[PDB]
Amino acid sequence: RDEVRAFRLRELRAAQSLTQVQVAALAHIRQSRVSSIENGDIGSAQVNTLRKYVSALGGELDITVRLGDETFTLA
Amino acid sequence: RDEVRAFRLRELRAAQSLTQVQVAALAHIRQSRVSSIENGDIGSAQVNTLRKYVSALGGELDITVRLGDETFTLA
């Protein structure tokens, strides 16, 4: 469900070995929202929020719409 | 531009003969959001809301984190 997702985000921070608070301020994000996404939430977060989280921990967040044969980019 | 991204979305909707008002009802999303997320405010868009919309256009929204060459899926 979201457990898989949660673990997809939890390890971005674990790899830098930073706490949830360190990151909220490294990415400039409410620690509440930071914790919510680490828990496989994400549906209630601005794309921006999510991007910052991932950028902060050295990744590139790519948002795409796949329709039929081809796909389109949003981020 | 993040306004060309969203204008690509406007055309997907239009090609399927749906007005913003219909799209709204279809994904149970406030019509106010759809106009903006169609005016290019993707960053500000709440993820699930943007999920809800892209599917009322018959699409899969696809969120992944690119690290090195390898990329990992969230949505």
Numbering used by the authors:
A (entry chain B), B (entry chain A): 27 to 101
From the paper:
In the present study, we elucidated the crystal structure of Mycobacterium tuberculosis H37Rv HigA2 (hereafter referred to as MtHigA2), which contains an HTH motif. The HigA antitoxin represses the transcription of HigBA or forms a stable HigBA complex, thereby preventing the ribonuclease activity of the HigB toxin and the associated cytotoxic events. Structural studies of MtHigA2 confirmed that it has three regions: (i) a disordered N-terminus that is liable to cleavage, (ii) an α-helix bundle containing an HTH motif for DNA binding and (iii) a β-lid for dimerization. The antitoxin MtHigA2 has two binding partners: DNA and the toxin MtHigB2.
The crystal structure of MtHigA2 was determined from three distinct crystal forms. Form I belonged to space group P212121 and was determined to 2.0 Å resolution, form II packed in space group P43212 and was determined to 3.2 Å resolution, and form III was solved in space group P3121 to 3.4 Å resolution. However, the N-terminal ∼25 residues are unstructured in all three observed crystal forms. All dimers share the β-lid as their major dimeric interface, but the position of the α-helix bundle varies. When the different dimers are aligned based on a single HTH motif from one monomer, the corresponding motif in the dimer pair shows a different relative position. The flexibility in dimerization leads to drastic changes in the locations of positively charged residues on the HTH motif, including His54, Arg56 and Arg59. To predict the physiological dimer, each form was submitted to the PISA server to calculate the strength of the dimer interface. Interestingly, all of the forms had similarly favourable dissociation energies (ΔG): −14, −15 and −17 kcal mol−1 for forms I, II and III, respectively. This suggests that the flexibility of the β-lid does not impact the formation of a stable dimer and is likely to contribute to function. The three different crystal structures in our study reveal the flexibility in dimerization mode while anchored by the β-lid.
